[PDB]
């Protein structure tokens, strides 16, 4: 196949421009994921009372601290309680002879008016909206859980159809889903709706996200096909500061998803400019289109060698690689070579403890730090030398001690978040950047090494059992933040155990680094 491809070019013009514009949409299809712990922030709110609400009625001397403490009891932070209010105006606290215990819990109600939402830092965001607030806390994570199952079917079903249509047909068409989708968010009128069409958005990142991959490797020579893959991985990096600059200037969650939806309207318009792989032409028997997206390619790089194409050489290179197709395999044939048993198992659990630890944390940045803008930008920024940094030791030290190293440093970097007290703010805020970094290090770690520890046969089968329990773990994720109305410890000590527990196990596993 690279002969055609050195005919062709198999790096130059055609390949830049084709990395760039899929960097970009990269880039923007990483805002979608993100975008979350700006458009569902939860304000800091209360319930709605007449004396602090009630502004037609008649005024008085009293300031808003005396009418807070009058109307709206304490809470566990050392605040006022966010779901309950005094059932009648409390006056006898206004007394300096007052006690904590002057009012007894028969004396207050939930919050029958609703609730009042601070709007100093966002204009609207959905858990204002549809009051995901006290009984309905779930609903938020709930919808995470949504996206991320929406993301786990939309890529089983996108294997399939890559194959029976094709990867840029397929992307293209996930391109416009994606843009319709996000649209349709921004506007729904209900919370199952907006879960709905959440859903089919991550429905289509899957897709997206498989075939861009997919699309860069098979016009790419073997030569640079590494730095391609890196650079399509730093995208996302780069995706992380473009959500906290974004949201930065939008406020307003209906006008964030709308900004975030439309460049893919953009990216469906020159999708059709992209050639199809030529390779899945000749494969299903089509050289005569092969040829012609050949062409097209030489033509863009200024390669003469086009006139060397006659289409013979395409049905007599390519041809021959459908020899694979003589024995299909399944995932329970990894499990039944003994030798291979064990080694399947603690790779797996990598790739779950990434995707869990990742999307646990990673969504409720508004827990981990003071300032979520910020924190956002730095897990952007500190993810590139992370991810590179881990390179380049693979790349001397060995894959083994790189994955363990970068597994085992995130887990006690999260751990240690816990530990340190609570008004040190901006050390628990780099320990949780430090943390996310790590778990970046090992995604690249476990994608080259799990690309390496098994026969060829069986390569891609193990490598896509791994994305499968990384998107399954990424589910997970978010529902672990459930058992923090026991504790706001509990979840970050989950997060923090299980990319140790896995790092522990990376100790077992054989080195593939050459000698
Ligand atoms: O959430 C899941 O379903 C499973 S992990 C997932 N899903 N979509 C994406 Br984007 N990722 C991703 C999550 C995290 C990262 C960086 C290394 C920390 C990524 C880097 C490149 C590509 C995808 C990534
Ligand atoms: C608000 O106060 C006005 C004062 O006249 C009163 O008429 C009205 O019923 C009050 N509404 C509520 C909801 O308390």
């Given at each position: 196949?690279?002969?055609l491809?050195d005919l062709v070019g198999?790096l130059g ?5 084709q990395?760039?514009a ?5 880039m ?10 700006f ?6 709110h209360?319930?709605?009372?007449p004396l602090?609400?009630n ?5 008085t001397?009293?300031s ?8 709206i009891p304490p809470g ?11 059932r009648?105006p409390?006056?006898q606290?206004?007394?300096p002879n007052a006690?904590?215990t002057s009012?007894?819990?028969?004396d ?6 609703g ?6 830092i966002?204009?609207?965001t ?5 009051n ?6 779930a609903?938020?994570?709930?919808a ?5 199952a ?7 079903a996108?294997?399939?159809?890559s194959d029976?249509?094709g990867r840029?047909?397929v992307?293209?068409?996930?391109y416009?889903?994606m843009?319709?989708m996000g ?10 709706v ?5 859903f089919l ?6 897709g997206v996200?498989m075939?861009?991959?997919?699309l860069l490797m098979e016009?790419?020579?073997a030569?640079?096909?590494?730095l ?6 730093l995208?996302f ?11 930065y200037?939008?406020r ?5 998803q709308?900004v975030?939806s439309?460049?893919f309207?953009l ?14 032409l000749?494969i ?7 040829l012609q997206?050949?062409?097209k390619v030489?033509?863009i790089?200024?390669?003469k060698?086009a006139?060397n194409?006659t289409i ?7 041809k021959e ?6 024995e299909?395999?399944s995932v ?6 003994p030798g291979l ?9 990598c790739?779950f ?6 999307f646990g944390?990673?969504?409720?940045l508004?827990?981990l730090?003071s300032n979520?803008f910020?924190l ?19 790349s ?9 190293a970068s597994?085992?440093?995130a887990?006690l970097?999260?751990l ?9 703010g901006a ?14 290090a090992?995604?690249?770690?476990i ?8 026969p060829?046969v069986?390569?891609?089968?193990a ?14 994720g ?14 970050l ?12 196990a990376?100790?077992l596993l054989?080195?593939t680094?050459?000698?």
């Amino acid at each position: 196949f690279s002969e055609l491809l050195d005919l062709v070019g198999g790096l130059g013009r055609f390949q830049v421009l084709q990395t760039m514009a899929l960097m970009v949409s990269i880039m923007w299809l990483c805002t979608q994921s993100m975008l979350e712990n700006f458009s569902a922030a939860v304000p800091s709110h209360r319930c709605w009372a007449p004396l602090l609400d009630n502004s037609t009625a008649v005024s008085t001397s009293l300031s808003p601290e005396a009418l807070l403490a009058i109307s709206i009891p304490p809470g566990p932070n050392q605040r006022p309680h966010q779901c309950r209010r005094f059932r009648q105006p409390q006056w006898q606290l206004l007394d300096p002879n007052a006690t904590a215990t002057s009012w007894s819990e028969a004396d207050t109600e939930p919050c029958v008016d609703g609730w009042v939402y601070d709007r100093s830092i966002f204009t609207s965001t959905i858990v204002a909206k549809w009051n995901l607030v006290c009984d309905s806390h779930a609903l938020k994570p709930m919808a995470q859980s949504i996206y991320l199952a929406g993301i786990l079917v939309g890529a089983a079903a996108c294997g399939p159809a890559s194959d029976r249509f094709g990867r840029r047909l397929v992307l293209t068409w996930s391109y416009l889903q994606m843009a319709v989708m996000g649209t349709a968010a921004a506007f729904a009128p209900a919370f199952p709706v907006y879960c709905l069409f959440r859903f089919l958005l991550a429905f289509a990142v899957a897709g997206v996200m498989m075939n861009t991959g997919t699309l860069l490797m098979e016009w790419t020579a073997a030569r640079a096909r590494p730095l391609v893959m890196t650079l399509n991985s730093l995208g996302f990096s780069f995706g992380h500061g473009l959500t906290a600059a974004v949201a930065y200037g939008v406020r307003d969650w209906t006008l964030l998803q709308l900004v975030v939806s439309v460049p893919f309207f953009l990216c469906f318009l020159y999708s059709w400019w992209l050639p199809e792989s030529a390779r899945w032409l000749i494969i299903k028997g089509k050289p005569d289109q092969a040829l012609q997206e050949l062409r097209k390619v030489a033509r863009i790089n200024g390669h003469k060698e086009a006139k060397n194409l006659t289409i013979e050489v395409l049905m007599s290179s390519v041809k021959e690689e459908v020899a694979s197709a003589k024995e299909p395999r399944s995932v329970l044939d990894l499990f039944c070579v003994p030798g291979l048993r064990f080694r399947t198992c603690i790779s797996t659990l990598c790739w779950f403890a990434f995707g869990f630890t990742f999307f646990g944390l990673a969504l409720d940045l508004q827990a981990l730090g003071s300032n979520i803008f910020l924190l956002q930008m730095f897990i952007g920024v500190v993810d590139i030398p992370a991810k590179m940094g881990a390179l380049l030791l693979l790349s001397h030290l060995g894959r083994r001690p790189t994955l363990a190293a970068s597994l085992l440093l995130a887990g006690l970097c999260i751990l240690a978040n816990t530990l340190v007290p609570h008004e040190m703010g901006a050390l628990r805020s780099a320990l949780a950047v430090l943390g996310l970094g790590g778990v970046g290090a090992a995604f690249t770690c476990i994608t080259i090494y799990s690309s390496e520890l098994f026969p060829t046969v069986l390569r891609m089968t193990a490598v896509g059992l791994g994305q499968m329990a990384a998107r399954g773990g990424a589910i997970l994720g978010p529902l672990v933040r459930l058992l923090g109305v026991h504790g706001p410890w509990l979840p970050l000590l989950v997060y923090g155990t299980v990319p140790v527990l896995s790092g522990l196990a990376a100790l077992l596993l054989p080195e593939t680094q050459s000698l």
